[PDB]
Amino acid sequence: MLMPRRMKYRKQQRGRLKGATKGGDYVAFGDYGLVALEPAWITAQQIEAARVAMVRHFRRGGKIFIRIFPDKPYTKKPLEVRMGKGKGNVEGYVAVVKPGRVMFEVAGVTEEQAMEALRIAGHKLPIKTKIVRRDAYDEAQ
Amino acid sequence: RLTAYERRKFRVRNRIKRTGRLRLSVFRSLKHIYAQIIDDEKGVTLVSASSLALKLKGNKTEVARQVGRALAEKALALGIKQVAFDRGPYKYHGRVKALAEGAREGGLEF
Amino acid sequence: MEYRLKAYYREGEKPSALRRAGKLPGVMYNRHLNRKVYVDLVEFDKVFRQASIHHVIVLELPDGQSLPTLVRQVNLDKRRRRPEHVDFFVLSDEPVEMYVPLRFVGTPAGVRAGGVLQEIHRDILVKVSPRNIPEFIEVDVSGLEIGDSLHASDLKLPPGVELAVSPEETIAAVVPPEDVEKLAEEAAAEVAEPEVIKKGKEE
Amino acid sequence: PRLKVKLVKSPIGYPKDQKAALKALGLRRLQQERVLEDTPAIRGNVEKVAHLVRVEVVE
Amino acid sequence: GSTRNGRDSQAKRLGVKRYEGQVVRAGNILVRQRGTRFKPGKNVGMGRDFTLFALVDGVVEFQDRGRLGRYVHVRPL
RNA sequence: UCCCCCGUGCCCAUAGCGGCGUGGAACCACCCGUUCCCAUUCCGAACACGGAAGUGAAACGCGCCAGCGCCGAUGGUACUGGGCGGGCGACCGCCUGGGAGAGUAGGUCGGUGCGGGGGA
RNA sequence: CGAUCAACGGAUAAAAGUUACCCCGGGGAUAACAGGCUGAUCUCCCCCGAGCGUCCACAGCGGCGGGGAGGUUUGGCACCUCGAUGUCGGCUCGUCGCAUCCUGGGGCUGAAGAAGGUCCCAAGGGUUGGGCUGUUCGCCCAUUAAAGCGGCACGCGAGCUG
RNA sequence: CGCCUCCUAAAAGGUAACGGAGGCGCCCAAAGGUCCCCUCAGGCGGGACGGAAAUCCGCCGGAGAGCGCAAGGGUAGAAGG
RNA sequence: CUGACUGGGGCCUGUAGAGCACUGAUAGGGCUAGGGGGCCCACCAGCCUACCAAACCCUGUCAAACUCCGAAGGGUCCCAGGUGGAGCCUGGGAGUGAGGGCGCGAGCGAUAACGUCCGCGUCCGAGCGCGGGAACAACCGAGACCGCCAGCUAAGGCCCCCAAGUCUGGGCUAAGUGGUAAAGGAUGUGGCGCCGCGAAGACAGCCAGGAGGUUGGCUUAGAAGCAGCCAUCCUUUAAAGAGUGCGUAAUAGCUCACUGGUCGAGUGGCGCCGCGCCGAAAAUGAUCGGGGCUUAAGCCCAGCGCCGAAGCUGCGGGUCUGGG
Ligand SMILES: [Mg+2]
Ligand SMILES: [Mg+2]
Ligand SMILES: [Mg+2]
Ligand SMILES: [Mg+2]
Ligand SMILES: [Mg+2]
Ligand SMILES: [Mg+2]
Ligand SMILES: [Mg+2]
Ligand SMILES: [Mg+2]
Ligand SMILES: [Mg+2]
Ligand SMILES: [Mg+2]
Ligand SMILES: [Mg+2]
Ligand SMILES: [Mg+2]
Ligand SMILES: [Mg+2]
Ligand SMILES: [Mg+2]
Ligand SMILES: [Mg+2]
Ligand SMILES: [Mg+2]
Ligand SMILES: [Mg+2]
Ligand SMILES: [Mg+2]
Ligand SMILES: [Mg+2]
Ligand SMILES: [Mg+2]
Ligand SMILES: [Mg+2]
Ligand SMILES: [Mg+2]
Ligand SMILES: [Mg+2]
Ligand SMILES: [Mg+2]
Ligand SMILES: [Mg+2]
Ligand SMILES: [Mg+2]
Ligand SMILES: [Mg+2]
Ligand SMILES: [Mg+2]
Ligand SMILES: [Mg+2]
Ligand SMILES: [Mg+2]
Ligand SMILES: [Mg+2]
Ligand SMILES: [Mg+2]
Ligand SMILES: [Mg+2]
Ligand SMILES: [Mg+2]
Ligand SMILES: [Mg+2]
Ligand SMILES: [Mg+2]
Ligand SMILES: [Mg+2]
Ligand SMILES: [Mg+2]
Ligand SMILES: [Mg+2]
Ligand SMILES: [Mg+2]
Ligand SMILES: [Mg+2]
Ligand SMILES: [Mg+2]
Ligand SMILES: [Mg+2]
Ligand SMILES: [Mg+2]
Ligand SMILES: [Mg+2]
Ligand SMILES: [Mg+2]
Ligand SMILES: [Mg+2]
Ligand SMILES: [Mg+2]
Ligand SMILES: [Mg+2]
Ligand SMILES: [Mg+2]
Ligand SMILES: [Mg+2]
Ligand SMILES: [Mg+2]
Ligand SMILES: [Mg+2]
Ligand SMILES: [Mg+2]
Ligand SMILES: [Mg+2]
Ligand SMILES: [Mg+2]
Ligand SMILES: [Mg+2]
Ligand SMILES: [Mg+2]
Ligand SMILES: [Mg+2]
Ligand SMILES: [Mg+2]
Ligand SMILES: [Mg+2]
Ligand SMILES: [Mg+2]
Ligand SMILES: [Mg+2]
Ligand SMILES: [Mg+2]
Ligand SMILES: [Mg+2]
Ligand SMILES: [Mg+2]
Ligand SMILES: [Mg+2]
Ligand SMILES: [Mg+2]
Ligand SMILES: [Mg+2]
Ligand SMILES: [Mg+2]
Ligand SMILES: [Mg+2]
Ligand SMILES: [Mg+2]
Ligand SMILES: [Mg+2]
Ligand SMILES: [Mg+2]
Ligand SMILES: [Mg+2]
Ligand SMILES: [Mg+2]
Ligand SMILES: [Mg+2]
Ligand SMILES: [Mg+2]
Ligand SMILES: [Mg+2]
Ligand SMILES: [Mg+2]
Ligand SMILES: [Mg+2]
Ligand SMILES: [Mg+2]
Ligand SMILES: [Mg+2]
Ligand SMILES: [Mg+2]
Ligand SMILES: [Mg+2]
Ligand SMILES: [Mg+2]
Ligand SMILES: [Mg+2]
Ligand SMILES: [Mg+2]
Ligand SMILES: [Mg+2]
Ligand SMILES: [Mg+2]
Ligand SMILES: [Mg+2]
Ligand SMILES: [Mg+2]
Ligand SMILES: [Mg+2]
Ligand SMILES: [Mg+2]
Ligand SMILES: [Mg+2]
Ligand SMILES: [Mg+2]
Ligand SMILES: [Mg+2]
Ligand SMILES: [Mg+2]
Ligand SMILES: [Mg+2]
Ligand SMILES: [Mg+2]
Ligand SMILES: [Mg+2]
Ligand SMILES: [Mg+2]
Ligand SMILES: [Mg+2]
Ligand SMILES: [Mg+2]
Ligand SMILES: [Mg+2]
Ligand SMILES: [Mg+2]
Ligand SMILES: [Mg+2]
Ligand SMILES: [Mg+2]
Ligand SMILES: [Mg+2]
Ligand SMILES: [Mg+2]
Ligand SMILES: [Mg+2]
Ligand SMILES: [Mg+2]
Ligand SMILES: [Mg+2]
Ligand SMILES: [Mg+2]
Ligand SMILES: [Mg+2]
Ligand SMILES: [Mg+2]
Ligand SMILES: [Mg+2]
Ligand SMILES: [Mg+2]
Ligand SMILES: [Mg+2]
Ligand SMILES: [Mg+2]
Ligand SMILES: [Mg+2]
Ligand SMILES: [Mg+2]
Ligand SMILES: [Mg+2]
Ligand SMILES: [Mg+2]
Ligand SMILES: [Mg+2]
Ligand SMILES: [Mg+2]
Ligand SMILES: [Mg+2]
Ligand SMILES: [Mg+2]
Ligand SMILES: [Mg+2]
Ligand SMILES: [Mg+2]
Ligand SMILES: [Mg+2]
Ligand SMILES: [Mg+2]
Ligand SMILES: [Mg+2]
Ligand SMILES: [Mg+2]
Ligand SMILES: [Mg+2]
Ligand SMILES: [Mg+2]
Ligand SMILES: [Mg+2]
Ligand SMILES: [Mg+2]
Ligand SMILES: [Mg+2]
Ligand SMILES: [Mg+2]
Ligand SMILES: [Mg+2]
Ligand SMILES: [Mg+2]
Ligand SMILES: [Mg+2]
Ligand SMILES: [Mg+2]
Ligand SMILES: [Mg+2]
Ligand SMILES: [Mg+2]
Ligand SMILES: [Mg+2]
Ligand SMILES: [Mg+2]
Ligand SMILES: [Mg+2]
Ligand SMILES: [Mg+2]
Ligand SMILES: [Mg+2]
Ligand SMILES: [Mg+2]
Ligand SMILES: [Mg+2]
Ligand SMILES: [Mg+2]
Ligand SMILES: [Mg+2]
Ligand SMILES: [Mg+2]
Ligand SMILES: [Mg+2]
Ligand SMILES: [Mg+2]
Ligand SMILES: [Mg+2]
Ligand SMILES: [Mg+2]
Ligand SMILES: [Mg+2]
Ligand SMILES: [Mg+2]
Ligand SMILES: [Mg+2]
Ligand SMILES: [Mg+2]
Ligand SMILES: [Mg+2]
Ligand SMILES: [Mg+2]
Ligand SMILES: [Mg+2]
Ligand SMILES: [Mg+2]
Ligand SMILES: [Mg+2]
Ligand SMILES: [Mg+2]
Ligand SMILES: [Mg+2]
Ligand SMILES: [Mg+2]
Ligand SMILES: [Mg+2]
Ligand SMILES: [Mg+2]
Ligand SMILES: [Mg+2]
Ligand SMILES: [Mg+2]
Ligand SMILES: [Mg+2]
Ligand SMILES: [Mg+2]
Ligand SMILES: [Mg+2]
Ligand SMILES: [Mg+2]
Ligand SMILES: [Mg+2]
Ligand SMILES: [Mg+2]
Ligand SMILES: [Mg+2]
Ligand SMILES: [Mg+2]
Ligand SMILES: [Mg+2]
Ligand SMILES: [Mg+2]
Ligand SMILES: [Mg+2]
Ligand SMILES: [Mg+2]
Ligand SMILES: [Mg+2]
Ligand SMILES: [Mg+2]
Ligand SMILES: [Mg+2]
Ligand SMILES: [Mg+2]
Ligand SMILES: [Mg+2]
Ligand SMILES: [Mg+2]
Ligand SMILES: [Mg+2]
């Protein structure tokens, strides 16, 4: 699954999750979309689970576009150590996702198929989602 | 993208302005040689002297020296004594050196 | 078609008040005028979904004028996916830069083989007379295998309409489909630990 | 004209500078009214502690 | 478990020490900086560590000459 | 007081890149020479001197063109000083004052001071 | 000029260990027990429906992921208690929870029957004797309707044991 | 465990944690002063040995190179050669 | 008179936000060195690639130690207001150098802790004095000099415990929701919106019709619409998919989809908002503080009135300070 091939820095401070998505808010490749309704760090494993379920729905066919990427390293202290003695080790990577972001898009597949795939994919994400389809507003951005 | 000439020129002029004197600037064309004594605080020329304007003669060096003396003369008459020599992109030598020595004889202070 | 939309002038009404009342703030302009306007959202939306930035909208002003315009830019509220402001661009007799819809006529060979047409550009940017606005532009994609592609250069244009984007600009492509048979080798595929760019006497 | 300023909500728990503002206005007790020249410096403090104050234009 | 980090250096208190309009005396330090963020202008010296200071008693003035950089002047009184 | 040019400044790309055009009377350049002053880690390319047959080819100056570059509104939004609410939380809103960035329209093939030289 | 006086404002020119033989002054400013906050970890329950189940996603199961509950585990934290809150196991005596081990009621079953599986309701009562080991736990023998799991300062040492 | 540079640091200064990353304990007789002169990396093209990269020629190339060493700031209208 | 604070004006800044021009990260596509692999070769060049993929380009993004940008604010100086238990200067005396909660901004921790460590602010500390919050240092209200069997308010309240409305008008909720919880689920309920289909008679019921090729195959070993994908073509139709599922060992076996008779007015589906429902298990006896509440004594909106403190007022007194 998804992770940076290289980084300038190994650990990142945590930051905040305030606000709507910075960009990434309109459909921009495929036909139907999955937009984040609430903020989260989405884990690489969760992203990959969402993806796999979608290709599984499609069996053969369609294109999946993944529009969020886990470049944030997630740190954790080893079990049972006490506080202090440095920062935890990286245990995974998350992609920060604030409300509005189109996380995934699909194309080349029927409507009932794009609907159901994004629904199932949604169930793998630890946030509330809405499925959108491409409008003129998307096309005008 | 500047040239060795544009650079040379800046580099010497920059040093001269830094000292705050009136600057005796010198232009040297293939044929003639001109001199402004400029006030850079005001962006103004105070006295001129040219081989072009003096309808001066022949040997360029001798000519330079003449504009040199010419400049100093109009200069002292205006109360200007001290001044700084702006050799421009020109080595202090030749016609320029000659111009310089002339404003010197002429009584200009530098 | 060519679509019509009632428009109205605003002075100091607060954009939030307008929006709270179903009205979408906006502005119309071109080189000659610049006026603060609003439209009814639900009316605008009805038009816009067919119109887009692609077709002419005529603004029925209360002063009695009827100005022909292109929607130039639409601001969406990023959290709610709703329009929050519109730019109406007032067409005049000069030619204008704009977006003209692509039609991809025909079923690509690649798609028969199981592939997927990626309609990379669903429109194309074009300098053109208002009096000359094409409904669309057909593009034959039937010769496309996985993984071939068309560019704007391959676009056969109508009269009086000139390309406004690099001919080298890719506009559609036919790419391999998703395949469950790839999952196992993807799910098993060992990915290396991230390299950390060396700082210091290292580099 | 003049500003008639009335302290009506307690400055307790509000940042020191709002307490300072009341002091510049010469307001020391709740319900106290002060009539002040309507100048821009005075008006600055009145606007600063606007959520603590009731203002009314006079004469 | 322990840290290879943990160090940092003293703060250096850099930056402008006298702003435009402020009356200075000959010698007053005007700017403290690394390299030439402001250049010495009229009546302003630069020490070996780029420190800008007043050459005469007077008033500070700033000047932004675009690609030529920013400048601190002191205008005599 | 206007036009051209030569110097020298100021604004610091709305002044730049590119394409086209144009100028040699004057001025400037290239130019002709390398005895002489001076000079090349070799080179008279540069710097420098002495010149005046030629040419505006190069350079420069002045025009024109918006492909790039640069500038860029208005409108709306983000964010926010201060004042208020909500949510168990991640977080979310209202009021008042301020208000971007992106983008859109559009703009730009510079403007101006001082002194010289020439012209009307 | 002589400082890794580098524990770098540098106690002496000159210095390591041990104490379960230990002592005093203090500290709940600070650990170990218990409680508390937290709930990562732990136990339990869900959402999703890939896939298994001859056939058939859902009888029985549930990839990759997702949401929770509990407060019995191991920890985190250091909040009362260090002018003392006795600490494991056993015995004795209970009492409560229910996520029920049995007994009663029930739906589904890939329930012919008998016997099971699975879930639901249900805490009234019941829930054995023994070998090993300090053990709690666990394994084992012989039985049983069953040989439940937890709380009560890991219930109970001004109740015993030790 | 002292010292330097960046971040944390909430756009003056300052600001903690056994927070996130790196350096110092030297050096240079020029690597110092001053006068004069010069301008980079990189890209394409061309050129015996000669190569991705040696030196040479052309065009483009404002600074991405250099500046003894970490980082940062600075810097060709030079601090670089 | 210089103070806190404030007004105006200049200068300084690199955060929020944003951006991608730098440093790096980055999905896809284009273009195209370089490898991998397949044709064709060793006579050295070719050609093909749905392979991995540099640089570049386009679309779309990410960053504390990125910034082409960039606020609100903040800092400082000048002028001005500002006479305050303000300020500045010299000196005498200290105590403190264990803090803590809360809000906001971060780091650490697990987007844990009544956690930890900084910043700005506040309060407790020292206001464990007073009102509210059931009770309760730091939440809301408010800074207690003394006295009063007087008045007005604050937060919070006005059905009874309990002072003041069983106050007025509009709406919702039927869960005692209110009176602790999530993903997720649902013909709960009210209200908006958008689609289909219908008096060229729909939906429900009472009645039919669902048909040829054709048990089609890249198809193994059965694969006849109903075990995978790279096919959906039609004949005939009033209609009927080479088919929604129930069915086989594969069939055959039924219905939908879809057309026809009866009625004769609606019917089916999506989405959004408000309030509710499930999801919801813990240990001595329960409980929203209690009683009790249902066109509320609950919730949303809009009002008028009252109650309510040691706050403010009235009356009297004390002491200090300033002024007479
Ligand atoms: Mg943190
Ligand atoms: Mg996580
Ligand atoms: Mg972490
Ligand atoms: Mg830690
Ligand atoms: Mg960590
Ligand atoms: Mg992880
Ligand atoms: Mg996001
Ligand atoms: Mg979900
Ligand atoms: Mg964009
Ligand atoms: Mg208050
Ligand atoms: Mg308060
Ligand atoms: Mg304040
Ligand atoms: Mg008071
Ligand atoms: Mg007070
Ligand atoms: Mg270490
Ligand atoms: Mg550190
Ligand atoms: Mg410091
Ligand atoms: Mg420090
Ligand atoms: Mg520092
Ligand atoms: Mg500064
Ligand atoms: Mg010096
Ligand atoms: Mg130096
Ligand atoms: Mg100024
Ligand atoms: Mg000045
Ligand atoms: Mg000129
Ligand atoms: Mg000029
Ligand atoms: Mg001037
Ligand atoms: Mg010509
Ligand atoms: Mg030209
Ligand atoms: Mg000529
Ligand atoms: Mg001629
Ligand atoms: Mg000649
Ligand atoms: Mg010779
Ligand atoms: Mg001679
Ligand atoms: Mg020559
Ligand atoms: Mg020419
Ligand atoms: Mg020249
Ligand atoms: Mg023009
Ligand atoms: Mg802009
Ligand atoms: Mg604006
Ligand atoms: Mg605002
Ligand atoms: Mg605020
Ligand atoms: Mg505003
Ligand atoms: Mg901004
Ligand atoms: Mg802007
Ligand atoms: Mg231009
Ligand atoms: Mg002139
Ligand atoms: Mg003239
Ligand atoms: Mg010694
Ligand atoms: Mg020490
Ligand atoms: Mg020592
Ligand atoms: Mg020390
Ligand atoms: Mg000693
Ligand atoms: Mg000694
Ligand atoms: Mg020692
Ligand atoms: Mg010992
Ligand atoms: Mg011993
Ligand atoms: Mg012994
Ligand atoms: Mg003994
Ligand atoms: Mg002994
Ligand atoms: Mg002893
Ligand atoms: Mg003792
Ligand atoms: Mg002692
Ligand atoms: Mg303690
Ligand atoms: Mg301590
Ligand atoms: Mg302890
Ligand atoms: Mg303890
Ligand atoms: Mg403990
Ligand atoms: Mg206790
Ligand atoms: Mg919990
Ligand atoms: Mg559950
Ligand atoms: Mg199966
Ligand atoms: Mg089955
Ligand atoms: Mg299956
Ligand atoms: Mg199940
Ligand atoms: Mg699992
Ligand atoms: Mg979880
Ligand atoms: Mg779990
Ligand atoms: Mg829990
Ligand atoms: Mg417990
Ligand atoms: Mg416990
Ligand atoms: Mg709890
Ligand atoms: Mg612990
Ligand atoms: Mg514990
Ligand atoms: Mg303790
Ligand atoms: Mg503590
Ligand atoms: Mg103790
Ligand atoms: Mg005691
Ligand atoms: Mg005792
Ligand atoms: Mg006791
Ligand atoms: Mg014991
Ligand atoms: Mg028990
Ligand atoms: Mg039960
Ligand atoms: Mg039973
Ligand atoms: Mg049976
Ligand atoms: Mg049987
Ligand atoms: Mg059963
Ligand atoms: Mg029972
Ligand atoms: Mg019982
Ligand atoms: Mg029992
Ligand atoms: Mg025995
Ligand atoms: Mg035994
Ligand atoms: Mg045992
Ligand atoms: Mg054992
Ligand atoms: Mg039995
Ligand atoms: Mg037993
Ligand atoms: Mg325990
Ligand atoms: Mg016990
Ligand atoms: Mg027990
Ligand atoms: Mg005991
Ligand atoms: Mg005992
Ligand atoms: Mg015991
Ligand atoms: Mg006891
Ligand atoms: Mg006892
Ligand atoms: Mg006891
Ligand atoms: Mg006993
Ligand atoms: Mg040291
Ligand atoms: Mg800082
Ligand atoms: Mg900083
Ligand atoms: Mg700072
Ligand atoms: Mg700050
Ligand atoms: Mg300071
Ligand atoms: Mg070190
Ligand atoms: Mg040398
Ligand atoms: Mg040097
Ligand atoms: Mg030297
Ligand atoms: Mg080169
Ligand atoms: Mg080459
Ligand atoms: Mg070769
Ligand atoms: Mg080469
Ligand atoms: Mg560099
Ligand atoms: Mg090094
Ligand atoms: Mg005053
Ligand atoms: Mg002052
Ligand atoms: Mg002041
Ligand atoms: Mg002020
Ligand atoms: Mg940000
Ligand atoms: Mg970038
Ligand atoms: Mg861009
Ligand atoms: Mg960020
Ligand atoms: Mg930063
Ligand atoms: Mg930043
Ligand atoms: Mg300020
Ligand atoms: Mg200011
Ligand atoms: Mg004043
Ligand atoms: Mg006084
Ligand atoms: Mg005081
Ligand atoms: Mg005081
Ligand atoms: Mg004192
Ligand atoms: Mg004393
Ligand atoms: Mg002391
Ligand atoms: Mg003390
Ligand atoms: Mg201490
Ligand atoms: Mg402490
Ligand atoms: Mg503290
Ligand atoms: Mg404090
Ligand atoms: Mg502390
Ligand atoms: Mg705090
Ligand atoms: Mg708040
Ligand atoms: Mg915080
Ligand atoms: Mg921090
Ligand atoms: Mg968590
Ligand atoms: Mg508390
Ligand atoms: Mg704390
Ligand atoms: Mg906390
Ligand atoms: Mg915290
Ligand atoms: Mg505090
Ligand atoms: Mg104390
Ligand atoms: Mg208080
Ligand atoms: Mg206090
Ligand atoms: Mg209190
Ligand atoms: Mg009390
Ligand atoms: Mg008290
Ligand atoms: Mg209280
Ligand atoms: Mg109370
Ligand atoms: Mg009470
Ligand atoms: Mg009385
Ligand atoms: Mg009243
Ligand atoms: Mg009230
Ligand atoms: Mg009550
Ligand atoms: Mg009662
Ligand atoms: Mg009553
Ligand atoms: Mg009533
Ligand atoms: Mg219920
Ligand atoms: Mg209730
Ligand atoms: Mg209840
Ligand atoms: Mg519902
Ligand atoms: Mg509803
Ligand atoms: Mg049949
Ligand atoms: Mg429930
Ligand atoms: Mg009512
Ligand atoms: Mg009262
Ligand atoms: Mg009082
Ligand atoms: Mg009396
Ligand atoms: Mg009185």
Length of chain A: 141
Residue A95's closest CA among A30, A132, A37, A48?
Answer: A48
Helices in A36-94 by DSSP H: which ranges? 44-58
The experimental technique used to determine this model is X-ray
Angle D20-D24-D25 from CA coordinates, rounded to 5°: 115
Q: What is the DSSP string of chain B?
A: ---HHHHHHHHHHHHHHHTT--EEEEEE-SS-EEEEEEETTTTEEEEEEETTTTT--S-HHHHHHHHHHHHHHHHHTTT--B-EEE-TTS-SSHHHHHHHHHHHHTT-B-
* Contact between residue C158 and residue C174 where contact means Cβ atoms under 8 Å apart: no
**CA B23, CA B16: separation in Å to the nearest integer?**
8
> How far from each other are the two terminal CA atoms of chain D, in whole angstroms?
6
Q: What is the DSSP secondary structure assignment for residue A87, as one 8-state letter? A: -
**CA D19, CA D25: separation in Å to the nearest integer?**
10
* Contact between residue B71 and residue B35 where contact means Cβ atoms under 8 Å apart: yes
**CA C45, CA A71: separation in Å to the nearest integer?**
38
Residue C182's closest CA among A55, A113, A47, A124?
Answer: A55
**CA D58, CA D37: separation in Å to the nearest integer?**
10
Q: How far is the CA of E50 from the centre of ligand 119 (A)?
A: 20
The two tokens of residue D11 are: 């400055």
Resolution of the experimental model, in Å, one decimal: 2.9
How distant is the Cα of A30 from the closest Cα of chain C, in angstroms? 8
* Contact between residue C130 and residue C93 where contact means Cβ atoms under 8 Å apart: yes
The pair phi, psi for residue B79, each rounded to 5°, is: 90, -10
**CA B81, CA B90: separation in Å to the nearest integer?**
23
* Contact between residue C70 and residue C57 where contact means Cβ atoms under 8 Å apart: yes
**CA C150, CA C169: separation in Å to the nearest integer?**
9
> How far from each other are the two terminal CA atoms of chain E, in whole angstroms?
64
Block residue for tokens 């702006």: B86
SS3 content of chain C, % helix, strand, coil (to 5): 15, 40, 40
Q: Which of helix, strand or coil describes residue C43?
A: helix
CATH class of the A29-137 domain in this structure: alpha beta
Identify the helix (H) or strand (E) that includes residue C163.
Answer: strand C161-163
The two tokens of residue C153 are: 């250069």
**CA D6, CA D46: separation in Å to the nearest integer?**
10
* Contact between residue B110 and residue B72 where contact means Cβ atoms under 8 Å apart: no
Block residue for tokens 């898009």: A105
Q: After which residues is chain E broken (C to N over 2.5 A)?
A: none
Please give the sequence-ordered ranges of beta strands (E in DSSP) within A52-117, or none if there are none: 63-66, 72-76, 89-97, 102-107
**CA C101, CA C116: separation in Å to the nearest integer?**
20
Burial of A21: CB neighbours in 10 Å, binned 0-12, 13-18, 19+: buried
How distant is the Cα of E3 from the closest Cα of chain A, in angstroms? 5
Nucleotide nearest to A83 (CA to C1'): I109
Q: Which of helix, strand or coil describes residue C137?
A: strand
Q: What is the DSSP secondary structure assignment for residue C153, as one 8-state letter? A: G
Residue C139's closest CA among C186, C161, C96, C171?
Answer: C171
**CA E32, CA C116: separation in Å to the nearest integer?**
63
The two tokens of residue A18 are: 């305030």
Q: What is the DSSP secondary structure assignment for residue A119, as one 8-state letter? A: H
Q: Does A85 touch chain E (CB under 8 A)?
A: yes
Please give the sequence-ordered ranges of beta strands (E in DSSP) within E1-77, or none if there are none: 15-16, 23-24, 29-32, 38-40, 44-46, 52-54, 58-64, 70-76
Phi-psi region of E21 (alpha: psi -120 to 50; beta: other; left: phi over 0): left
Residue C56's closest CA among C89, C102, C93?
Answer: C89
Q: Is the peptide bond before D44 cis (omega within 30 degrees of 0)?
A: no
- Which residues from E are below 8 Å from A86, CB to CB? 1-3, 5
The two tokens of residue A136 are: 């003129």
Residue A9's closest CA among E3, E6, C199?
Answer: C199
How distant is the Cα of A10 from the closest Cα of chain C, in angstroms? 7
E45-73: burial string, b at 16+ Cβ within 10 Å, e else: ebeeebbbbbbeebbbbbeeeeeeeebbb
User: What residues contact residue A58 under an 8 Å CB cut-off, 6+ apart?
Assistant: A64, A109, A113, A117, C177, C178, C180
Q: What is the DSSP string of chain D?
A: -EEEEEE-S--TTS-HHHHHHHHHHT--STT-EEEEE--HHHHHHHHHTGGGEEEEEE-
**CA E52, CA E47: separation in Å to the nearest integer?**
7
Distance in angstroms: CA C71, C1' G43 = 61
Positions of strand G less than 7 angstroms from a protein CB: 40-41, 47-51, 63-67, 74-77
Residue B26's closest CA among B80, B102, B100?
Answer: B100
Q: Which of helix, strand or coil describes residue E61?
A: strand
* Contact between residue B35 and residue B49 where contact means Cβ atoms under 8 Å apart: yes
Q: Is the dihedral of CA D28, D30, D33, D39 positive or negative?
A: positive
- Closest protein residue to F13 using CA and C1' atoms? E67
**CA B23, CA B40: separation in Å to the nearest integer?**
8
Block residue for tokens 């929050």: C84
In chain E, whose CA is at the least distance from the CA of A88?
E1
**CA D25, CA D49: separation in Å to the nearest integer?**
10
User: What residues contact residue C94 under an 8 Å CB cut-off, 6+ apart?
Assistant: none
What are the structural domain ranges in chain A?
A: 29-137
Identify the helix (H) or strand (E) that includes residue C109.
Answer: helix C109-112
The two tokens of residue A77 are: 């202290």
Does the beta-carbon distance from A62 to C116 stay under 8 Å? Answer: yes
Phi-psi region of E27 (alpha: psi -120 to 50; beta: other; left: phi over 0): left
Q: Which residue among C54, C78, C114 places its CB closest to the CB of A61?
A: C114
Positions of strand I less than 7 angstroms from a protein CB: 3-13, 17-19, 23-31, 50-51, 57-66, 75-78, 80-86, 105-113, 115-116, 121-123, 139-143, 183-184, 228-232, 272, 311-313
**CA C180, CA E17: separation in Å to the nearest integer?**
68
Q: What is the DSSP secondary structure assignment for residue A83, as one 8-state letter? A: S
* Contact between residue A54 and residue A117 where contact means Cβ atoms under 8 Å apart: yes
The two tokens of residue C48 are: 């816009």
Cα D45 to Cα D13, D26, D29, D40, E27: the distances in Å are 18, 11, 16, 9, 39
Q: What is the DSSP string of C164-189?
A: -S-TT-EEEEEEPPPBGGGHHHHHS-
* Contact between residue C202 and residue C177 where contact means Cβ atoms under 8 Å apart: no
Identify the helix (H) or strand (E) that includes residue A111.
Answer: helix A111-122
**CA B45, CA C192: separation in Å to the nearest integer?**
72
User: What residues contact residue A123 under an 8 Å CB cut-off, 6+ apart?
Assistant: A53
Residue E60's closest CA among E19, E16, E17?
Answer: E19
Strand pairing class (C137-140; C96-105): parallel
Q: Is the CB of D1 under 7 A from strand I?
A: no
Cα C16 to Cα A63, A99, C5, C19: the distances in Å are 40, 21, 21, 5
Cα E43 to Cα A75, B20, B42, C158, E60: the distances in Å are 55, 10, 16, 69, 10
